[PDB]
């Protein structure tokens, strides 16, 4: 999930 997913 987010944060830290480079597609968020």
Put residue 7 in one of left, alpha, beta given phi > 0 → left and psi -120 to 50 → alpha: alpha
Number of Cα atoms under 13 Å in the Cβ half of residue 7: 1
Quote the CA–CA distance of 3 and 5 in Å, as a whole number. 6
Quote the CA–CA distance of 6 and 1 in Å, as a whole number. 10
Evaluate the omega torsion of the peptide bond into residue 3 and state whether it is cis, within 30 degrees of 0. yes
| Under 8 Å between Cβ of 1 and 7 | no
Q: What is the token pair recorded at 6?
A: 């480079």
């Amino acid at each position: 999930g987010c944060p830290x997913n480079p597609k968020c």
